[PDB]
Design a protein around this ligand. Structure first.
Ligand SMILES: Cn1c(=O)c2[nH]cnc2n(C)c1=O
Ligand SMILES: Cn1c(=O)c2[nH]cnc2n(C)c1=O
Ligand SMILES: Cn1c(=O)c2[nH]cnc2n(C)c1=O
Lengths: 108, 107
């Protein structure tokens, strides 16, 4: 458990997971339930904050770069898949700015 | 700032010289590039040239202001372009380097 991963769990995940915009990212996209049949045709590496939260919990990551990449993949999937006007894009944009801000003060 | 000098001289140099960085070294010219819808979809254009000038003339107050400009540039690319466009892959490749370099910023 590196200091950075610790920071990513205690500071970054703590901040993002409890956020009023977090709820659509707390679990993988359910393409059936959300009625997005082309989702897994366009997004080939799905990611979400539940997966990351669990991986930070089970010390799945060897580096912070890895956990950072997963956050980035989750936000990037949303910007790529969704129409520019979808509310979820601006929800992801809001979360991703918190993530960046926090990451600006991560150790090492 | 020590962090802004790291963004200038470690992160931005790595990104600037990358073989995929050429579309991002200067603002999108919607006219020359044939994209008249570009500014109706992208309301905050951003590019590494602007970020570079801004680091040179001391525009930024904090690292995170500059990291937010990098992100806006990448996010603009994902939002405007179709998922199949090569520029999407180019941006992600550049974005991962940025995330990797930022992890090692002086705290
Ligand atoms: C958990 N959650 C919320 O917190 C929320 N707020 C508004 N819609 C919401 N939906 C659809 C939801 O699932
Ligand atoms: C991440 N994500 C999306 O990318 C998306 N697109 C449409 N609904 C969506 N929902 C609810 C979602 O969670
Ligand atoms: C950033 N950017 C784009 O987002 C884009 N979309 C299509 N060509 C593009 N070019 C040349 C570009 O520089």
């Amino acid at each position: 458990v590196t200091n950075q991963l610790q920071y990513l769990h205690k500071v970054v995940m703590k901040a993002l997971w409890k956020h009023q915009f977090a709820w659509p990212f707390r679990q993988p996209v359910d393409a059936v339930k959300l009625g997005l049949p082309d989702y897994h045709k366009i997004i080939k590496q799905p990611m979400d904050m539940g997966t990351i939260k669990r991986r930070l919990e089970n010390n799945y990551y060897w580096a912070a770069s890895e956990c950072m990449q997963d956050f980035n993949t989750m936000f990037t999937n949303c910007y790529i898949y969704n129409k520019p006007t979808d509310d979820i894009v601006l929800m992801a944009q809001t979360l991703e700015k918190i993530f960046l801000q926090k990451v600006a003060s991560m150790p090492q």
